[PDB]
Paper text:
Here, we report six structures with near-atomic resolution captured by cryo-EM, representing human Eag2 (hEag2) in closed, pre-open, open, and pore dilation but non-conducting states. We expressed full-length hEag2 fused with a green fluorescent protein (GFP) in HEK293T cells and characterized its electrophysiological properties and show that it is a voltage-activated delayed rectifier potassium channel with a half-activation membrane potential of −10.0 ± 3.5 mV. The tetrameric hEag2 apparatus adopts noncanonical non-domain-swapped VSDs, with distinct pore domain configurations.
Six distinct configurations captured for hEag2 are primarily based on the pore dilation and ion distribution. For hEag2, in a closed state, the four pore-lining S6 helices form a bundle-crossing in the middle of the membrane right below the ion selectivity filter with two layers of hydroxyphenyl or phenyl residue, Y460s and F464s, forming the hydrophobic constriction sites through intrachain and interchain π–π interaction to prevent hydrated/dehydrated potassium ion flow. The hydrophilic constriction sites together with the hydrophobic ones form a long channel gate. In the closed states and pre-open state 1, a strong and unambiguous density peak is located between the hydrophobic and hydrophilic constriction sites. The density is more likely to be a dehydrated potassium ion, and we name it site 6 or S6 as the seventh potassium ion selectivity site. If our closed states represent the deep closed state, we suspect that the voltage may act on both S4–S5 linkers and constricted sites for the hEag2 channel to sense the electromechanical force. However, there may exist a deep closed state (for example under −70 mV membrane potential condition), and our closed structures may still present a pre-open closed state.
Numbering used by the authors:
A (entry chain A), B (entry chain B): 11 to 301, 320 to 403, 408 to 692
Amino acid sequence: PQNTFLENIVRRSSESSFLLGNAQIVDWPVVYSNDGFCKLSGYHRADVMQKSSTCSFMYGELTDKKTIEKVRQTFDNYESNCFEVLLYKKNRTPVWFYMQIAPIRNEHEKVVLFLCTFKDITLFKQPIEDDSTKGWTKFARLTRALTNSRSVLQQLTPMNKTEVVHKHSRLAEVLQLGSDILPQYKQEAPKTPPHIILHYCAFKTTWDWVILILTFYTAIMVPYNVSFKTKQNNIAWLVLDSVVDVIFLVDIVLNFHTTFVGPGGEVISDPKLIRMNYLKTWFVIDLLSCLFSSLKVVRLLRLGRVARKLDHYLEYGAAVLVLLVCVFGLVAHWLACIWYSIGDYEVIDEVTNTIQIDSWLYQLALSIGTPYRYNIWEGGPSKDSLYVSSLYFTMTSLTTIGFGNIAPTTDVEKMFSVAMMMVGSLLYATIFGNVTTIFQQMYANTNRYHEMLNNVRDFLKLYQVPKGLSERVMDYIVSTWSMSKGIDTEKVLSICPKDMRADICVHLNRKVFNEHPAFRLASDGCLRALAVEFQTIHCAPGDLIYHAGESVDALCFVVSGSLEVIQDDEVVAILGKGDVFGDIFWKETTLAHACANVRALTYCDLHIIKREALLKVLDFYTAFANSFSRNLTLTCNLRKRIIFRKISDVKKEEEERLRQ
Amino acid sequence: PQNTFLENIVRRSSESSFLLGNAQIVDWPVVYSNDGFCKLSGYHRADVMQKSSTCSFMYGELTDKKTIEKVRQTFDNYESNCFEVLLYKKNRTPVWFYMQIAPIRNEHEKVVLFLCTFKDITLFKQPIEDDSTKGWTKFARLTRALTNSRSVLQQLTPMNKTEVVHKHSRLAEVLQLGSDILPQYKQEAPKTPPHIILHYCAFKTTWDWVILILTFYTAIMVPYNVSFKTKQNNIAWLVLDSVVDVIFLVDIVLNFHTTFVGPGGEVISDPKLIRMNYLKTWFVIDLLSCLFSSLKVVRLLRLGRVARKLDHYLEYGAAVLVLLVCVFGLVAHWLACIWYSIGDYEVIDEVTNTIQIDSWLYQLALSIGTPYRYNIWEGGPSKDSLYVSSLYFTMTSLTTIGFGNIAPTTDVEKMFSVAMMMVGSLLYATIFGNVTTIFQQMYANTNRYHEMLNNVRDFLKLYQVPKGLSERVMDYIVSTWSMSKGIDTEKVLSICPKDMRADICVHLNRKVFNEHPAFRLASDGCLRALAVEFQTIHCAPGDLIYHAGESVDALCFVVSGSLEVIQDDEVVAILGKGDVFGDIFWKETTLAHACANVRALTYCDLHIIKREALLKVLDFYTAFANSFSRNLTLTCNLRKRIIFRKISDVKKEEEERLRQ
Ligand SMILES: [K+]
Ligand SMILES: [K+]
Ligand SMILES: [K+]
């Protein structure tokens, strides 16, 4: 969601000198100056900014009087025109310019900035100058002033009386740029050229899933047709092949119109580069795959598409497991096809006209019930039994079960089963490794929690901490890991540098900013500083925040629960739900003694800000410091003692007073 | 690629007093003084340096006048000679020296330094001295002055009239050291003695690979010939054994000429140590291996070479997997040989003349179709079937499949298969462990990324951060891990102490040094300091760098993208591609309030330098501070406010002015 507006202007201007200036401000100050205007005028792009976009500060002695007023109305009412003005450069050189004013538009059709395109026509006109000594001085400067607009732009007729042709060319340039000078200043979305498909669109993902399904179907079906002959053709299996072939041809055609992700950058939408990118990467595999035994078996090259498209899924853990189960099934099927091919070859030695007792097909025929007949040779098991038997055998050898119904007993079968076992061992090992890694991924976090728990327990047991204090520590550990689930705030906030840290911290401390009268005249910067400086704590019933002699160095705001400030074993304050206690740091400059114990009745919630951070923030911002001083009344100041005398003391002392 | 020049000089001088001095500088200052010249003259090697290499500061009263001039021309035109001079030591002792000047040469044949070898001939001449009281004082000092040159060098004829012999010896010494005094001062490469082969050469790696292939071939072939008899000799299997044996003899001969890597140091090229290093390490295994059943079976000791040479490959993960697959195959082959040996022994009990029904050879003969005949005993399976069957069986027991075609049923076979299973369990477990470690190696990094992603997601969900801000955080996380791929700059730059940190940081910030006019009069040290002090940030569209009240404490250089400085909801500046904004830290000494909001239009790229580091660098370097102050013009100073009044305000106020 970029806002590429300067990029479009510099891509369309083709070495121009646009002078973008603000519109809603009086005098229309200049906002941006291209580094082509720094040469046409001699002003560096630090002295031209914040000046009028009329170029009023280059208007001089003999500047055309009417043009100044006319461009003034042109800026008054928002409209676009073109002018020929006679300005002065930084060297007081009378030089002509072509003004191509064109207002810009906002998102919801509002004028925001004024664009001013400039061109130099010094050699194209007659710049009458007073401080001259010879006629030639009136000509050489013409070659000096125009260098990139005469030898580059108009060099075909550099002859006199063609100045009217130059004026006509300027008029044609200004008239035929109605939409080229208004790229609609706006925060837009990425745009693609016509007839280009985004690689992450909703259609492309569905197309990729369909291609994956079809590739798996072809991988399943091609070896079956190659090995289990099945040369009989039907209606429900001869049109599907053609449909899949034309679908893959459509995919090849449509893959020329995809947005290839750049090496570390973003998407590229240039048809002039994607075409040979695809050509050099994967135009060989697809062509051969989508074109006799070789022609029907080459279709297995379609797995390259599956390999390419499965990159983001391969990152996860369970996706690799599903992929490996799928390839396990596919490898079992392929080995079943090869096993049946061997078994069919070996039966019935063709040199003689006998049947080999060794081959697993003969043993399977014996164990099934249907034997071979005739001596041409006909009989044996049906076509479903052969495939299910081959798959069963090659699945008993990949899972390392090996029952022994169907087993190698011929010279070829044994030396093929050796390769079967060699491959299956590695495949099965990879499956085991993936499963154990998947389990370790979660048991890592669980064991990370349990290790800390065990370390705390062993530390408490080793130093014989008395019961009643170890219980509190263990309860705190359990409760904090229950509430937070091991999610530390500091590690998460370390990431996301200080643009989102401030926003997150302002959101977290919303319960001390929105509902408290001190933080209502604070600018956003001060609120961000305070939010990033607070930090928060969680209390538990019976826990003391301040003792009877601790140094108060924090302002604490209670957002949930109830506190109890007790002094001399007497309750002197009860706090809760919007009460602030602590000390007046900003006008005492001395750490105090906490005069009373602040216990927690219920499960409390406090946002405490340290003394130093608060003092720094209040020192940096002045007006908010006064507002905070005036608008903060502490409900329990833990610096001054409350002077009182209990009733029981009076009642006791009265007895002795009467006695004496 | 060392520059060992002092080492060669001290190894060749044999306790001399060379006085290396620079040549291209006037007066030829002394550069280095050996700690043998600190005794011949009494000058410590801190007062003799930066003095003339002519020893002009030891030239005294009665020094030989002609020799001073002659050595002066000898230094004038670059040439080597020898002189006999009469200098004074630190104690003003008239002492004779032998000068052996010899210029040194650069890489491309240039004179750089002048070498001056010295010797003492005090006792070898007549040092007439004035402050003497008795004749014996003219003799004892002769023994005092010469101690390491008379009792060590010339002690065979310590008799008078032999001083001419000493002069002849000095002449022979100086004449026959033409190349020994010029070791060609140059940054050379490691040099090996003639007829010594570098262990990491391109020939040695090919030789090692060939030896590995031959060792695997021998390991495959020797047990087959020992067990599967095959005593018939052919032409294609009797010369190969001799060729391999002579190749291994050549390897044994050639292993005496290898550069053994020292214990923690570098290669050693001393033939006097490598020979007994190899002799003590591995001269016993090779000799016996390269020398009846014992003689043909001892050739399996060649696996020691494989074990030795496979040390760097064993570090990786996949190499161990390939090695374990190879040893799995080799162990299966060896167990096949042992299994066939047992099966061949057990058939046909030789005490009687019957055939044992139990032995697996008989069952295999029944299941194949070819039975035993005769009762000497002839028939059975062919020689290919026996080996393929043995390998199949011992592969069904190592992969834990166990079909059951071929299975132990005799007393010996069962108690051998027990050991088979015991070994195979451990081998198969090791293969599984290696596979799971290999997978964990990469899933560690992937899970490390996913754990942080999940923690961020759970933190956002737990604290109910509103939508529209959690989306930005998640997008930032995804985008930064996409661009950087988890490669943190700080951890990489922590390594490589501050010689390559400076160079790397200068290279990274090349887009603010080369194309910016402030950094053009800065020495390399200042550029290194600034580069190591910058740090860089990446922005995103809509992200704010400075708010309306933040403290500007950084100079920011934009190298890619576009920024937008807006004040009072009005665009006042547009930045991009070489624009610097911030504050003038070096002449204000006060943190300011950012007067405007700096938003990012497109994906920006900023190099920001903090206030304190910049101030330290500009304080340490003085002239560059002035150059930086003069040559830096901020395009948007975020300290001063721009005073303006919008057009809508004027238009609105005019209506009320007319109304009243
Ligand atoms: K099994
Ligand atoms: K069985
Ligand atoms: K079995």
